[PDB]
Amino acid sequence: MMTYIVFILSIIFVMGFVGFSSKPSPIYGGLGLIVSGGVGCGIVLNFGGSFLGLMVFLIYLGGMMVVFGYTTAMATENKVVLGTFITGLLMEFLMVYYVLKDKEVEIVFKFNGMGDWVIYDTGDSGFFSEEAMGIAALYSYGTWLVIVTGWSLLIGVVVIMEITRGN
Amino acid sequence: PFFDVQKKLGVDLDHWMTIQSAEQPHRIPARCHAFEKEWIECAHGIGSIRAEKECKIEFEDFRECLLRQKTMKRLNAIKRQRDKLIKEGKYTPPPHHSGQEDLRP
Amino acid sequence: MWFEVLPGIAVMGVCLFIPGMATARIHRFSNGGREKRVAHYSYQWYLMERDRRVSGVNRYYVSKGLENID
Amino acid sequence: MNPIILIIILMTVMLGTIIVMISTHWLLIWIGFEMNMLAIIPIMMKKHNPRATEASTKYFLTQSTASMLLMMAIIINLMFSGQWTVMKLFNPMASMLMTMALAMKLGMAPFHFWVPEVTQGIPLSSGLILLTWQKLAPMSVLYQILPSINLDLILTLSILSITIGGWGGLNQTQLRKIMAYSSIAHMGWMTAVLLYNPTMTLLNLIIYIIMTSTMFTLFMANSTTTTLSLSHTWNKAPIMTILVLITLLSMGGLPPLSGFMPKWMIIQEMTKNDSIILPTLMAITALLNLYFYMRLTYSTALTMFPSTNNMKMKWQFPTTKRMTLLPTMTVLSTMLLPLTPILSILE
Amino acid sequence: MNLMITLLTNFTLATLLVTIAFWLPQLNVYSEKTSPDPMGSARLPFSMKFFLVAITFLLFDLEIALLLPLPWASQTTNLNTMLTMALLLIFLLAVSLAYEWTQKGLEWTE
Amino acid sequence: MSLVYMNIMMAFTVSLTGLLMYRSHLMSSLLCLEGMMLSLFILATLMILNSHFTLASMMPIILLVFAACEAALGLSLLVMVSNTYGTDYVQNLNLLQC
Amino acid sequence: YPTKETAHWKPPPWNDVDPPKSNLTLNFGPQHPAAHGVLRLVMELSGEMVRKCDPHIGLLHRGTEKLIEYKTYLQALPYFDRLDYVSMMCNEQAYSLAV
Amino acid sequence: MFMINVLTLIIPILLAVAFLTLVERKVLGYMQFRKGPNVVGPYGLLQPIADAIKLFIKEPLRPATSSISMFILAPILALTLALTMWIPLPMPYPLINMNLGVLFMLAMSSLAVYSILWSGWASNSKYALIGALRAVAQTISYEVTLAIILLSVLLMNGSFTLSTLIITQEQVWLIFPAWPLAMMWFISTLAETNRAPFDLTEGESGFNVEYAAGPFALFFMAEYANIIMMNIFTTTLFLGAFHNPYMPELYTINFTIKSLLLSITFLWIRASYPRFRYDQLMHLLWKNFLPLTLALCMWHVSLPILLSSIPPQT
Amino acid sequence: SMMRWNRERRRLQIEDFEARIALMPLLQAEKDRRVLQMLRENLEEEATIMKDVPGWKVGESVFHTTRWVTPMMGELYGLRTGEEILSSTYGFIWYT
Amino acid sequence: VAAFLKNVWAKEPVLVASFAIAGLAVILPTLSPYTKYSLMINRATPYNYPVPLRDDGNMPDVPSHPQDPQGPSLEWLKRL
Ligand SMILES: CCCCCCCCCCCCCCCCCC(=O)OC[C@H](COP(=O)([O-])OCC[N+](C)(C)C)OC(=O)CCCCCCCCCCCCCCCCC
Ligand SMILES: CCCCCCCCCCCCCCCCCC(=O)OC[C@H](COP(=O)(O)OCCN)OC(=O)CCCCCCCCCCCCCCCCC
Ligand SMILES: CCCCCCCCCCCCCCCCCC(=O)OC[C@H](COP(=O)(O)OCCN)OC(=O)CCCCCCCCCCCCCCCCC
Ligand SMILES: CCCCCCCCCCCCCCCCCC(=O)OC[C@H](COP(=O)(O)OCCN)OC(=O)CCCCCCCCCCCCCCCCC
Ligand SMILES: CCCCCCCCCCCCCCCCCC(=O)OC[C@H](COP(=O)(O)OCCN)OC(=O)CCCCCCCCCCCCCCCCC
Ligand SMILES: C=C(C)[C@H]1Cc2c(ccc3c2O[C@@H]2COc4cc(OC)c(OC)cc4[C@@H]2C3=O)O1
Ligand SMILES: C=C(C)[C@H]1Cc2c(ccc3c2O[C@H]2COc4cc(OC)c(OC)cc4[C@@H]2C3=O)O1
Incomplete structure (x- = not known):
């Protein structure tokens, strides 16, 4: 049961999206997307992407969904929602029952039903996280990427100040 | 259009993140470095039409390194026959696959 | 006078002293009288699991030296 | 808007298109589309009225959904190929998702439902940018992935675009919506010949950009956004009615005009590949857009109209509007058919 | 694993104390209150400046996200390129701040 | 293939169907769009970490940063709609039907 | 071609600008x-x-x-003590000078 | 055995937060030429106990809320985040020794604004929502300089590891090469925790005026559970103590004394100044701290390269 | 002071890395015998399990090449108990 | 050049300190002599294994042992 923990989080992740795509309100939609970001971040952290998991927490949840909740507060002061929620939940639990009774499934692609602990690597990486040094490579190998991203963010600041002015 | 400015000016804008076989930081290999290298060296220069049919075996080896569908299928078959013989009782696990042997190195 | 604030400061200081001394004594207790092994990097984890194998008692902290080889 | 900031934002639109055109890595393709969208959003909100905010919001949602589908296509390509080259895709699911996403960025049917609205809500210069410059980057990506494009999907999208662009502009009196349904129909004409000969796709793209640039430049020169204000042009400047005459006759595909040039070549490249029925019904549908062009120039451009007395004030002032490249674009959008073998420079 | 134990323990202790806080004085039968604010019932007006400082936070937080691998990037062998791109990113953050300055975006929450 | 990939793609398609046909708050559409971005982040991260392809470790951060900037842009459009109608109901965005 | 459904559609404004279709009042009691x-x-x-x-x-x-x-x-x-009740004898002095 | 370590972390946190109220009232008393509590306990030592028991037996509101569920989730998230900030703190050894503890604490402290936002949602008072939005914009403003100052210092650390930061300061305190970072950091942590002169929750009515004595005592204590933590974090970051690995309690006494003096420095700042106007601290962040913080971030990028003092990666 | 101490710390890091380098051939030899041990044990247990299945080749490579492929995690720890599986698959990630 | 500078140092000393520290951070690594040693130390740090070479017969500059006098040395780092 502990061997499938990534898989278990993934189920919650799917559930979390059906939690907010049913859309009772942007308030509870934001709450569901924050819980979904937490559990998908747990998925990322369980493969060794610790820096990318802390980028989910710092930038997605701590940076951006704060601004979504802020704008939901300031600008935005059932049957369809609950029905779409229970519909997606029944679809996902029938998928879980299929893939656990069969250990093989095909919706669009062919998917194994064992846990994803098998597909890892048996080596080590010495005195570094490979993911950390690959993100450190943004400044040494990623010059053009830094240029286009910084120009896009500068243009993003300029564009926000243009269209929020109204004049 | 693909205006190949990077080759005309001789600059390396984004060829480096393109494949797994490229120069990585601290010489870290990808898991399928050898397979991708073999498939790239097969399909080089012969065009995509000849590459889809003349480099099928390297590409199948590389896609099966990436996804491990055949390996997981074989592990499913072995684990399923093992579970059947455990349920029937015609097989017993050895002490080195039950965790009673105090590993080697 | 001003030394009346010192009993509350001393109580709060004991409350801040307890977690650090606690985790120091617990890490010395659970690791064979020594510091907890820090495995930030995969080489450290490989050496630590190799220690757990070569100890023979399924503990990384049980150290084996020259007496273990002939 | 500050003209320096306007120059910087237009250079960022151009820079995003250039990054999509030149880059070898799929992430930089996605980055170029993100840069292009993020930069073009203020060009649509130049006049700051609620129609432009609605148009920019609809454009944002369509291009953002298209960009997410593009990144999902890139990610499935990474699953099934382990690499990032902008070349053919290595999964038909990535092929379908990227064809859908580029169809959303072009405005092809069944994702056409924003192109008549957004073009209506934004000014004529930003609508010119939307219907000409924003077609260059997804046609470049479609030009580079055509070994992986499913033929049935691209032909379904193409003929659906041609039928909806044909039967959507029959009802239209707004000039920007006529240009938008014309856009949808011409993108169908470009993408149906894509897997047969992509040079004729580029030929159709360049002739379309010339004719669309001519039409929006005449619209800005006359300040006419409707059919009825276009009818009031002969009493102000008679040559402008002649130019919208010849350019609308060219966009439907009359011989011997230049807009007959691409689609004829397209039919010429579809019968080589033994497709007879498809370019036949394709040009049957193009006869319907030519037919409402001929109503929209016969009934309401040629035979002269009741005017208003205030127009006799406007006789005393000439046009000081910068009609940039307008005679060159009007000559090229009409009189280029004798140079039809120029297309080989696009090979 | 021990991390999840710690997080679960903190969530458990917080939920325990919050439930005891919400339900230990609900044992009391104090009184039932009817009780029939600066604004009375007016709708909350949108403040444009609060939204502008939230988006300015979001964009500078993204520029921070680009800045975050610098202690690892200082360990590279391509230090001239790395130092150039680091100074370029902090300069572009400063240019975004200067444009936010001079276009009066930082006013009445300066 | 991997089984967690099916769940991440199913999450992506759930938020994609939540974006497409509801005709509700505009903020709910932006929430579905950023859920699509979240699932793309998770899926790119699990693939790049799975294959040990080191240079693409900076790729999801890029996928974060641009798209979060994109999100900021969307909110400003919403605020302009929120400065026009008082609501973010997308059925107020029907001026351009005619 | 106005149908039965597409019949209430008035044309858009000539300058393509629609009309825009208030300040807060607080009560600190x-x-x-x-x-x-x-x-x-x-x-x-x-x-x-x-x-x-x-x-x-x-x-x-x-x-x-x-x-x-x-x-x-x-x-x-x-x-007069209780009027300006931090200035008691000053108000006393004012009233006393008056009387 | 690990659960004993978690409990001896988190129960003395709540006790230290309880007696921090007494230390606040006493130290503010003597600075104001008076006494703090000395009646309830001997030298006031039973005042936090009596106060916590008094709050836990008051009637709560249970008002008409826009959300009951977020009215419940705001104290739970507040206490849970206030307790999880302490788990990578190396004193001298942490509960959870992680490679990215600094970035962890930055991310979890960025998550703390949802307590303020949900507490502003849960009260139906629109003015409490306005004050919550002002508090959130204050906190997200100063998180920017927290992130950039912390990045500039970790350029001298070499990693995101909090225990490496003890090895970093074995010769000199890191306040000597980074005192402008240290003083902007200290004022920014003061502005993070809604602490005077940056508090805007007592006067022009805060976000947590809806809460009365059931959740409020929890909110408050979670808030002070941040404050000590931030000072402890500042103590790790700029005032790194001597660590003898054979006597760890030397480090524990040394960092405890420094963290107490720094929390008392918070108390001594709030008793000495008036408050900011709201746009004045927005002026303080965006126009005074942020250009200097960018300039010093450029200086701490280029400085180890130009002195050949790039710190070790491991 | 930070200049002198970070130069000293870089010298100490080089010393630690050279101790690692000097130990790496012995660790490489033990790791090679470790993985060939586990593959040979899985091969013998497959040979004593997979006899009921018709058309089965024991130890059949799924790769068309004859090059040595680095063994996957579920290839080595596929027939062992869940404790050793969980250790070898999430121990370093879950370590403290 | 000193009237405007004294004026901005009297009105905006925060921005004067900001632009001065930023200017020093830009220009000073191009003037420091120690910037070479940063590069030299970051390439002297052995993250990977020093993979040996097959002795073809003629490689005099490659040592046969770590303690041999030929090869790269770090005496510049031990002295500094
Ligand atoms: C961590 C341990 C403790 C750290 C120290 C903190 C303890 C003491 C705290 C005292 C009480 C503080 C209460 C809060 C006060 C908030 C208000 C305030 O101070 O605002 C900040 C004020 C803001 O300005 P202001 O508010 O005074 O003025 C108004 C602003 N103008 C002028 C624009 C109208 O100052 C700063 O922002 C300074 C921040 C630190 C500056 C560091 C400078 C470094 C020097 C570099 C060299 C310079 C020389 C020239 C170049 C040389 C080159 C070689
Ligand atoms: C990490 C360090 C943490 C430290 C936390 C604690 C700090 C403070 C420690 C205690 C300080 C002294 C407290 C003394 C309280 C007053 C005692 C007293 O005399 O109370 C008198 C009262 C009534 O007496 P009565 O008999 O009626 O008098 C008539 C006489 N003819 O009789 C009574 O009220 C009954 C007796 C009450 C005694 C209460 C004592 C304090 C309890 C506090 C709880 C925590 C204790 C410490 C926990 C950690 C150590 C184990
Ligand atoms: C294989 C592909 C490789 C690439 C090939 C090249 C592709 C070319 C695509 C051209 C797209 C042009 C889009 C429009 C020009 C861009 C800048 C712009 O919008 O300029 C218009 C400008 C706006 O000024 P403003 O003040 O805002 O006007 C409002 C009125 N008061 O000023 C005005 O409004 C003035 C009015 C006249 C403007 C006429 C502009 C004509 C531009 C198109 C020229 C023809 C296309 C080039 C040749 C064919 C190339 C395919
Ligand atoms: C309304 C909903 C409820 C709201 C209240 C409760 C939620 C909020 C408060 C709790 C927040 C939980 C945050 C958990 C993850 C924090 C990031 C993290 O784990 O970083 C630490 C560390 C990275 O460092 P590293 O040293 O590389 O790892 C060891 C490798 N040698 O990584 C590790 O050590 C990895 C350890 C294994 C993986 C840990 C996964 C934890 C569980 C996933 C998140 C659960 C919470 C989901 C909700 C979040 C908030 C919405
Ligand atoms: C080349 C070096 C690197 C440069 C890039 C990195 C910069 C790091 C700091 C980032 C700062 C970001 C924001 C900067 C905005 C600058 C413009 C500005 O503030 O102008 C307005 C101001 C008048 O103030 P006001 O508009 O009223 O604002 C309210 C306060 N009263 O007017 C002013 O304050 C006048 C500002 C210009 C004069 C400053 C001169 C400083 C000289 C220091 C010594 C030389 C340093 C070498 C570099 C030259 C710098 C000019
Ligand atoms: C956590 C425990 C054990 C108790 C003690 C306690 C609370 C809850 C809230 C508070 C508190 O202690 C003090 C009480 O007195 C003042 C007086 C103040 O100003 C006069 C002041 O200003 C910020 C703050 C306060 C604290 C405050 O709010 O629960
Ligand atoms: C109203 C619209 C859209 C079009 C259709 C139309 C006109 C103008 C004029 C005429 C016209 O209908 C045609 C019908 O058939 C022919 C056939 C002819 O030749 C085949 C021919 O030669 C001049 C002339 C005619 C009609 C003719 O005069 O504008």
Whole structure:
């Protein structure tokens, strides 16, 4: 049961999206997307992407969904929602029952039903996280990427100040 | 259009993140470095039409390194026959696959 | 006078002293009288699991030296 | 808007298109589309009225959904190929998702439902940018992935675009919506010949950009956004009615005009590949857009109209509007058919 | 694993104390209150400046996200390129701040 | 293939169907769009970490940063709609039907 | 071609500009210490700015100077301590100089 | 055995937060030429106990809320985040020794604004929502300089590891090469925790005026559970103590004394100044701290390269 | 002071890395015998399990090449108990 | 050049300190002599294994042992 923990989080992740795509309100939609970001971040952290998991927490949840909740507060002061929620939940639990009774499934692609602990690597990486040094490579190998991203963010600041002015 | 400015000016804008076989930081290999290298060296220069049919075996080896569908299928078959013989009782696990042997190195 | 604030400061200081001394004594207790092994990097984890194998008692902290080889 | 900031934002639109055109890595393709969208959003909100905010919001949602589908296509390509080259895709699911996403960025049917609205809500210069410059980057990506494009999907999208662009502009009196349904129909004409000969796709793209640039430049020169204000042009400047005459006759595909040039070549490249029925019904549908062009120039451009007395004030002032490249674009959008073998420079 | 134990323990202790806080004085039968604010019932007006400082936070937080691998990037062998791109990113953050300055975006929450 | 990939793609398609046909708050559409971005982040991260392809470790951060900037842009459009109608109901965005 | 459904569609405006289809009013009542006691304030704000400030007083109106008319001069003297009740002997001195 | 370590972390946190109220009232008393509590306990030592029991037996509001569920989730998230900030703190050894503890604490402290936002949602008072939005914009403003100052210092650390930061300061305190970072950091942590002169929750009515004594005592204590933590974090970051690995309690006494003096420095700042106007601290962040913080971030990028003092990666 | 101490710390890091380098051939030899041990044990247990299945080749490579492929995690720890599986698959990630 | 500088140092000393520290951070690594040693130390740090070479017969500059006098040395780092 502990061997499938990534898989278990993934189920919650799917559930979390059906939690907010049913859309009772942007308030509870934001709450569901924050819980979904937490559990998908747990998925990322369980493969060794610790820096990318802390980028989910710092930038997605701590940076951006704060601004979504802020704008939901300031600008935005059932049957369809609950029905779409229970519909997606029944679809996902029938998928879980299929893939656990069969250990093989095909919706669009062919998917194994064992846990994803098998597909890892048996080596080590010495005195570094490979993911950390690959993100450190943004400044040494990623010059053009830094240029286009910084120009896009500068243009993003300029564009926000243009269209929020109204004049 | 693909205006190949990077080759005309001789600059390396984004060829480096393109494949797994490229120069990585601290010489870290990808898991399928050898397979991708073999498939790239097969399909080089012969065009995509000849590459889809003349480099099928390297590409199948590389896609099966990436996804491990055949390996997981074989592990499913072995684990399923093992579970059947455990349920029937015609097989017993050895002490080195039950965790009673105090590993080697 | 001003030394009346010192009993509350001393109580709060004991409350801040307890977690650090606690985790120091617990890490010395659970690791064979020594510091907890820090495995930030995969080489450290490989050496630590190799220690757990070569100890023979399924503990990384049980150290084996020259007496273990002939 | 500050003209320096306007120059910087237009250079960022151009820079995003250039990054999509030149880059070898799929992430930089996605980055170029993100840069292009993020930069073009203020060009649509130049006049700051609620129609432009609605148009920019609809454009944002369509291009953002298209960009997410593009990144999902890139990610499935990474699953099934382990690499990032902008070349053919290595999964038909990535092929379908990227064809859908580029169809959303072009405005092809069944994702056409924003192109008549957004073009209506934004000014004529930003609508010119939307219907000409924003077609260059997804046609470049479609030009580079055509070994992986499913033929049935691209032909379904193409003929659906041609039928909806044909039967959507029959009802239209707004000039920007006529240009938008014309856009949808011409993108169908470009993408149906894509897997047969992509040079004729580029030929159709360049002739379309010339004719669309001519039409929006005449619209800005006359300040006419409707059919009825276009009818009031002969009493102000008679040559402008002649130019919208010849350019609308060219966009439907009359011989011997230049807009007959691409689609004829397209039919010429579809019968080589033994497709007879498809370019036949394709040009049957193009006869319907030519037919409402001929109503929209016969009934309401040629035979002269009741005017208003205030127009006799406007006789005393000439046009000081910068009609940039307008005679060159009007000559090229009409009189280029004798140079039809120029297309080989696009090979 | 021990991390999840710690997080679960903190969530458990917080939920325990919050439930005891919400339900230990609900044992009391104090009184039932009817009780029939600066604004009375007016709708909350949108403040444009609060939204502008939230988006300015979001964009500078993204520029921070680009800045975050610098202690690892200082360990590279391509230090001239790395130092150039680091100074370029902090300069572009400063240019975004200067444009936010001079276009009066930082006013009445300066 | 991997089984967690099916769940991440199913999450992506759930938020994609939540974006497409509801005709509700505009903020709910932006929430579905950023859920699509979240699932793309998770899926790119699990693939790049799975294959040990080191240079693409900076790729999801890029996928974060641009798209979060994109999100900021969307909110400003919403605020302009929120400065026009008082609501973010997308059925107020029907001026351009005619 | 206007059909039965596409019949209420009026043309868009000629300049493509539609009409745009208010400021906050706060009531800081007698529930507040940094106003020095008993004051109601009807603020009219425009964001951070104060457009209008309407003080409502009378929350300590006690009819002092109607009570003074029914008391003698010596009996009326301690009312003046209780007017400016951090300036007691100054108000005593003002009333005493008057008398 | 690990659960004993978690409990001896988190129960003394709540006790230290309880007696921090007494230390606040006493130290503010003597600075104001008076006494703090000395009646309830001997030298006031039973005042936090009596106060916590008094709050836990008051009637709660249970008002008409826009959300009951977020009215419940705001104290739970507040206490849970206030307790999880302490788990990578190396004193001298942490509960959870992680490679990215600094970035962990930055991310979890960025998550703390949802307590303020949900507490502003849960009260139906629109003015409490306005004050919550002002508090959130204050906190997200100063998180920017927290992130950039912390990045500039970790350029001298070499990693995101909090225990490496003890090895970093074995010769000199890191306040000597980074005192402008240290003083902007200290004022920014003061502005993070809604602490005077940056508090805007007592006067022009805060976000947590809806809460009365059931959740409020929890909110408050979670808030002070941040404050000590931030000072402890500042103590790790700029005032790194001597660590003898054979006597760890030397480090524990040394960092405890420094963290107490720094929390008392918070108390001594709030008793000495008036408050900011709201746009004045927005002026303080966006126009005074942020250009200097960018300039010093450029200086701490280029400085180890130009002195050949790039710190070790491991 | 930070200049002198970070130069000293870089010298100490080089010393630690050279101790690692000097130990790496012995660790490489033990790791090679470790993985060939586990593959040979899985091969013998497959040979004693997979006899009921018709058309089965024991130890059949799924790769068309004859190059040595680095063994996957579920290839080595596929027939062992869940404790050793969980250790070898999430121990370093879950370590403290 | 000193009237405007004294004026901005009297009005905006925060921005004067900001632009001065930023200017020093830009220009000073191009003037420091120690910037070479940063590069030299970051390439002297052995993250990977020093993979040996097959002795073809003629490689005099490659040592046969770590303690041999030929090869790269770190005496510049031990002295500094
Ligand atoms: C961590 C341990 C403790 C750290 C120290 C903190 C303890 C003491 C705290 C005292 C009480 C503080 C209460 C809060 C006060 C908030 C208000 C305030 O101070 O605002 C900040 C004020 C803001 O300015 P202001 O508010 O005074 O003025 C108004 C602003 N103008 C002028 C624009 C109208 O100052 C700063 O922002 C300074 C921040 C630190 C500056 C560091 C400078 C470094 C020097 C570099 C060299 C310079 C020389 C020239 C170049 C040389 C080159 C070689
Ligand atoms: C990490 C460090 C943490 C430290 C936390 C604690 C700090 C403070 C420690 C205690 C300080 C002294 C407290 C003394 C309280 C007053 C005692 C007393 O005399 O109370 C008198 C009262 C009534 O007495 P009565 O008999 O009626 O008198 C008539 C006489 N003819 O009789 C009574 O009220 C009954 C007796 C009450 C005694 C209460 C004592 C304090 C309890 C506090 C709880 C925590 C204790 C410490 C926990 C950690 C150590 C184990
Ligand atoms: C294989 C592909 C490789 C690449 C090939 C090249 C592709 C070319 C695509 C051209 C797209 C042009 C889009 C429009 C020009 C861009 C800048 C712009 O919008 O300029 C218009 C400008 C706006 O000024 P403003 O003040 O805002 O006007 C409002 C009115 N008061 O000023 C005005 O409004 C003035 C009015 C006249 C403007 C006429 C502009 C004509 C531009 C198109 C020229 C023809 C296309 C080039 C040749 C064919 C190339 C395919
Ligand atoms: C309304 C909903 C409820 C709201 C209240 C409760 C939620 C909020 C408060 C709790 C927040 C939980 C945050 C958990 C993850 C924090 C990031 C993290 O784990 O970083 C630490 C560390 C990275 O460092 P590293 O040293 O590389 O790892 C060891 C490798 N040698 O990584 C590790 O050590 C990895 C350890 C294994 C993986 C840990 C996964 C934890 C569980 C996933 C998140 C659960 C919470 C989901 C909700 C979040 C908030 C919405
Ligand atoms: C080349 C070096 C690197 C440069 C890039 C990195 C910069 C790091 C700091 C980032 C700062 C970001 C924001 C900067 C905005 C600058 C413009 C500005 O503030 O102008 C307005 C100001 C008048 O102030 P006001 O508009 O009223 O604002 C309210 C305060 N009263 O007017 C002013 O304050 C006048 C500002 C210009 C004069 C400053 C001169 C400083 C000289 C220091 C010594 C030389 C340093 C070498 C570099 C030259 C710098 C000019
Ligand atoms: C956590 C425990 C054990 C108790 C003690 C306690 C609370 C809850 C809230 C508070 C508190 O202690 C003090 C009480 O007195 C003041 C007085 C103040 O100003 C006079 C002041 O200003 C910020 C703050 C306060 C604290 C405050 O709010 O629960
Ligand atoms: C109203 C619209 C859209 C079009 C259709 C139309 C006109 C103008 C004029 C005429 C016309 O209908 C045609 C019908 O058939 C022919 C056939 C002819 O030749 C085949 C021919 O030669 C001049 C002339 C005619 C008609 C003719 O005069 O504008």
